[PDB]
Design a protein around this nucleic acid. Structure first.
Ligand code: SFG
Ligand code: SFG
Ligand SMILES: OC[C@H]1O[C@@](CO)(O[C@H]2O[C@H](CO)[C@@H](O)[C@H](O)[C@H]2O)[C@@H](O)[C@@H]1O
Lengths: 249, 250
DNA sequence: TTGTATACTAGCCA
DNA sequence: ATGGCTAGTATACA
DNA sequence: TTGTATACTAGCCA
DNA sequence: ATGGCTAGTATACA
């Protein structure tokens, strides 16, 4: 197991003490949305006030671990995003609401509403001096698109010559079960977006915390990009998968 | 103007009393977001708790105007979306969060955050039997794409033959200044979006309300598709532009 | 091919 | 407890 | 070219 | 109070 990367088969809400206050530059949180999924446990079986209470509980434990320059990304569903973001705006300051456009809509069979195709990500910061580096995550143009975008007014601009801001909508397709990156986990997140977070909001060598790491996608991002990692996952199968994913680099 | 198209150059909060309760089938609300724009007035000059108080004010005026079958779309910025939606969930039930992907990001020059390219839209309903008709808003495939999506298992499915759900992310570019649609209004909304909303959530001939109609995009949307319209705008020039836009269809 | 505006600059330093 | 200066910001319409 | 799974049906009726 | 049954749900991986 590489150095700096640290995986625990433990519940975060109980081991939070083992984590020094103000030791983490970035929290990458993909917690249970409150949607009834089966992680081999009932963590995503909560809902309503129950789920939101649990959310704010683990959040109150996690926040004090952020150093003053720290930041946080938190995934959730629109069904609970208003309440969650409202609570977090009392503690931290919201820098962005990033929309993950999964490209592939949820199934079921409804015709009474619009089908789900996005997840919500709150991007919060402790203080106004939060760390943020755009250059590693700039998206470079290809020959054709740069040609289509180039104008003398824009020539030499950083966004045109180096690459543009990924913007607060990320259109990255969800991972097909047969996708090469896919592992046996119900709600695995594309490494693309997690790497974007690690790169833009964690300095090289900084420490990232994933209190609900699942298959360890954030562990992989940190390993590939030279960041330190800490992760918690109550399911040992997912934890072993994370070990595997990391050691294969 | 056509038949069921009522354009009132009146402040909505003083004139909502005139509109009968349980009169409106759909509310298409694009209120000021609280970002500091200039509509010839200080409506968007509010911010923070004072802006959220004014939002609650006009919302409390507008909700009772909904028939038990009615619905509401509300445009907002991620900056005030959590509080506004949190408050609306206590008055109505949320059916969707629609993300308008504007394709063109906001300018400025920042480097210390991700650039704004999406507006938030809350889709709420009074009761669990709200009126929703997906067929008129379905998006049919072209030939090549229908060939790429067809499979024996899918053949005959309504989504493959008639059209697929727009989903809760609508990718539609903002109206360029020189765009045909565009008029002299700072925050004009694409007719595609507004029309999708009107067609999916207002019964033909029903009444839709626009507390702040601006250029009357919703007015056009209802004129075509044959729906009734009541809109309010305090700017006489915006009301003028709306009058023109409506008296140019057919 | 190209000009150009579109709901959502910000950190210093004074 | 405010400004102003700087380096900086994409797409798609006509 | 084709099979196939993917964080988020929903109303009725025995 | 509880299944089961219905009509029904898009893309992009391999
Ligand atoms: N108290 C808890 N402590 C640690 N893990 C938990 C806890 N509660 C739920 N979990 C796990 O958190 C994970 C949430 C997942 N969304 C993580 C997915 C992860 N982003 C991935 O790419 O694989 C699940 O695997 C849960 O089993
Ligand atoms: N009390 C008020 N009553 C009526 N209109 C108002 C009021 N306050 C602000 N407005 C107007 O609300 C409008 C908000 C706009 N975003 C509407 C845009 C509109 N959807 C369009 O396509 O043009 C502005 O034009 C304001 O002039
Ligand atoms: O959490 C930041 C978030 O709050 C908003 C409105 O909800 O602004 C509020 O908080 C700001 C903190 O920087 C204050 O400056 C502002 O006065 C207050 O309204 C959003 O602007 C912002 O995204």
């Amino acid at each position: 197991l590489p150095s700096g990367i640290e995986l625990h088969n433990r519940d975060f809400l109980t081991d939070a003490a083992h984590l020094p206050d103000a030791s983490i530059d970035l929290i990458v949180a993909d917690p249970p949305y409150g949607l009834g999924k089966d992680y081999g446990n009932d963590s995503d079986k909560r809902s309503g006030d129950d789920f939101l209470a649990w959310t704010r509980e683990w959040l109150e434990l996690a926040i004090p671990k952020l150093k003053p320059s720290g930041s946080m990304y938190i995934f959730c569903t629109w069904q609970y995003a208003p309440e969650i973001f409202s609570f977090l705006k009392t503690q931290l300051t919201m820098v962005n609401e990033i929309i993950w456009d999964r490209r592939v809509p949820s199934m079921g069979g409804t015709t009474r509403r619009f089908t789900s195709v996005h997840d919500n990500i709150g991007f919060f910061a402790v203080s106004r001096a939060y760390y943020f580096d755009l250059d590693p995550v700039r998206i470079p143009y290809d020959a054709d698109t740069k040609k289509a975008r180039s104008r003398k007014l824009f020539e030499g601009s950083k966004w045109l010559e180096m690459g543009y801001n990924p913007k607060d909508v990320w259109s990255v397709s969800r991972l097909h079960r047969q996708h090469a990156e896919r592992v046996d986990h119900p709600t695995q997140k594309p490494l693309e977006i997690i790497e974007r977070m690690v790169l833009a909001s964690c300095p090289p060598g900084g420490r990232v915390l994933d209190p609900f790491m699942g298959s360890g996608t954030t562990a992989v991002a940190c390993a590939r990009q030279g960041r330190d990692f800490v992760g918690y996952e109550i399911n040992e199968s997912y934890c072993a998968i994370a070990h595997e994913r990391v050691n294969a680099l």
